[PDB]
Symmetry: D4
Subunit: 162 residues, 8 copies
């Protein structure tokens, strides 16, 4: 029941995107927690969350942020755990600011970045799953099955109907 993955985002507005990561982890039966931590508004909350993540049993952290997106990066600065970042699409720059802010981490502090938006949130969950599967045979089996189904479920031709 104890969470092994932590999904964090700066505000409620990010949930529309981050819910996809939540849904996928639940689908693959991966225990996790979902919280709001703002790098700009609650920097001390972030410091404490990231600093204690390992001892609390978390193995992976999935952080979503848009615009001047610091959440994934600053989180990674305080934890040795692998941190995955989801660029949340921004209004004006369509997530380009979100993407560059997260992916361009200088050497020494990594953040595995996923695609902008929903697809990135879902993939962050899947990447976290593939990480946990390395040492969890049962989960590895569920993931393999999930991937196999995805492949087998692709249609052979498009519905070309007018």
């Amino acid at each position: 029941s104890a969470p092994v993955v932590g999904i964090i985002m700066g505000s409620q507005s990010d949930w529309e995107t981050m819910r996809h990561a939540d849904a996928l982890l639940t689908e693959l039966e991966i225990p996790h927690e979902t919280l709001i931590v703002s790098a700009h508004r609650t920097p001390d909350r972030l410091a404490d969350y990231a600093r204690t993540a390992a001892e609390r049993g978390l193995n992976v952290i999935i952080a979503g942020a848009g615009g001047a997106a610091f959440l994934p990066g600053m989180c990674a600065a305080w934890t040795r755990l692998p941190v995955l970042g989801v660029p949340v699409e921004s209004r004006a720059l369509k997530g380009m600011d979100s993407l560059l802010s997260i992916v361009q981490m200088p050497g020494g502090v990594p953040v595995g970045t996923l695609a902008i938006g929903a697809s990135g949130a879902k993939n962050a969950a899947l990447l976290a799953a593939s990480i946990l599967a390395l040492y969890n045979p049962a989960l590895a089996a569920r993931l393999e099955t999930w991937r196999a189904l995805q492949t087998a479920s692709v249609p052979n031709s498009p519905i070309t109907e007018d």
Copy 2:
């Protein structure tokens, strides 16, 4: 004598750019400190630096950073003081990543952003000067002189 402006940068590599902010402040005789504080590598140092800036007597903070530039923003998250950000030019993206990372702050935690590179470092110092000038008559006069000399020194025709 006590510093009223704090100039901070992520690493030695930022100095080539941030040295321009240092030179300007010195030129206008504005007491300041110039330190290295990394948002990515020394987050606690940053937290402590920003938390105590006001208490220490600092009035403005000038922070330079490139790539996923967090220094100015995170610093502003821990202080009520005006934080000015300098986007340091990055190798690949020429500071576009630096600029977006710094300027696109969400409402509630501001960072007055300047141009990418040396021009931005110099302007951060000048902007800090114009801020300090609001309550320092002597400095205000020196800033007026600096701006006047800048304007008067522009040649009338190219060489």
Copy 3:
């Protein structure tokens, strides 16, 4: 009652964005004026406004502009006061033209630039407030309280409900 902050914009269309700066200054009880000054259509009005701002008692100027955004920059060319620039989102280029036009000031004439749009307008007001607070204990106290409330008001978890 005398204004210490000047909020200027090129046209009525900018008000939708600049009203956020106005609202925040009023919220923090900072006396200010709100005017329309077009760098392209009323260059002499701009020259006079910027040139006399200091003697008129203004301490900070917040200027909004989009597209070929010259208002903040040209204003700064005529005043020694700190000028803050708000990139107003443009139709086609989503404020990227507005942003580069304002932030890329050459060495010698600064403009503290904020984010594109509403968030930038609000932050320009907050930055102006943090500047005025340096020499206004009462305002400093109001700002500190405002910042503290912002931090304390951040929810701990997202409303994950379907």
Copy 4:
């Protein structure tokens, strides 16, 4: 003898680019003046330059500027004369900032914008020439000759 075209730039650093506009005008024997006028550093000089351009007999103004490029635009705000803008290549953003700052003029105050760099400086001169040619038969003939030579001089195969 009196100049009919005014070439202006923010600083000496723009000369490397704007010298191409000067060379072209000279080649076509178009009387012109080449000056330094900074929108940021010498705003009053700019205002005066633009306000009086028409009175002085100038027909077209070619203005070069980089980064937050305001020279062409602000000049057009003070004159009814055609203003052509040359985006000077900037260090970091390679003139993309220069280009957007100049070309994106709102309706009501135009600036005919040319390509970033030397090509743009040369074309501003040529565009000014084509404008002047509309009411100067002699120049029109010289422009026709220039364009004809350009076309005829292109090699048929690479070396």
Copy 5:
């Protein structure tokens, strides 16, 4: 009655933007023609139009085009007359492809480029007017009056009402 300005565009879809150039020329009483010439679909029509523009009495050509926008440029390759280009906003790239395609002319063949969209179309008309005014006192007077009115018509403050 003979046209002195030629407004051309690649298709009917460009009219929504180019109509602003048409309206402004008419407003300033500048005789002009409005035609459709496609650089991609009617290259020979373009060659002939541009090649004969001068002898037909045209003094300025205003060409609008979007995407791989060649109309202004190719027109300029066939005429000695000044050619003004209007980048028509494109669906996906918002006119950025239109803008670069038109403004980046190599040294030797100029195109005075205006802003993306409606504002650019209107300004192309105004630029054409300022060119014609150089040798047409009456038009020069109308333009001066138009510019003066624009400046005088700018409001002093925004309608800040809720």
Copy 6:
């Protein structure tokens, strides 16, 4: 012996890039002509070149151009033959202007666009080869050999 592929470029400056298309065609022994045709400077030459390409026996046209790159597009406007465009890297915008100018052709007049630079020039030749291979068994075999050698030659580990 008669050329079946025509390689064209706006000027000598494009040769550094387009020479790669020439080398590849020669390597695969594909008869071709390499000429300079400027869309901006020699529009009539271009019109004539494109109008008569088919009649002359050409099967594919490879056109290189940078900046406001019109060569490939305008050529395609005058011929029914497949036109492949190579975006030449531009000084300031690094070929982004070249790429958008070429690839964003409206429906009705296509241009098969390749990568910016030398890689694109080489691929245009290869793409032209794959087209010609559809009806030339000998060439098809040589292309298969070329592709096979490319694949087999890749090292297993870095030096």
Copy 7:
């Protein structure tokens, strides 16, 4: 009746764009097949499709893909046939990711890339047609007629009505 052109796309969502290629090939009477092959979800299906395309009689392959668009490129890595790529417009980046992912092929493995979206799909079909026409007199005649009609069908002036 045997297909000489293969139109492939990663999912049903691409059909809205790829249908234009299908429609044009049918219009010019070019036999073709339309299938769904995902480079990400069905990599082995792609390998087999591309590898056997030539022996199956296919002469040209038109592949559409958006975002991290690998379909055209990977297809070209397995076939000697000419592969044409259609960048499918993406939500956030408007097809810019699609465009760069497809057009920037390294030297050695080409992909003739067309414009982003519908126009690109239609042009991929036309390019494929111009390729097939090189050795099919009847088709060459149909294409010539199609091109001639396009040119002749362009209106001479825009419907300037209010």
Copy 8:
């Protein structure tokens, strides 16, 4: 001794960048293999490499690629193992094409993307280390030491 991390790149030219991932893994004493696998030139080699990665004992794959960068993505399409992608800086577009090609993976097949260039190569190794550390106490301790040294080594002021 058996490799637990596989570092792959499209060609020798990527080594200048990917060597940083190799150095980091060696520094942390993480058994790994460093190979050249081209998505464009050796697709079957890639398919085989990715299909069998898990069976061979590999835990994480680090793939570097530039331009139309497919290596990381296609590799992830054939393996259930975590795939980390390094955007190699491209000549013209400075790795922007590399970055978008790698990071914009559709839902269902992920690739943890790192920064463009050497910084990204180094971080991919570190990220792979943090993953491996989850089930390797010894390595976890070494990673903690590495991160601690990085933090403690940052100077307090610029030289």
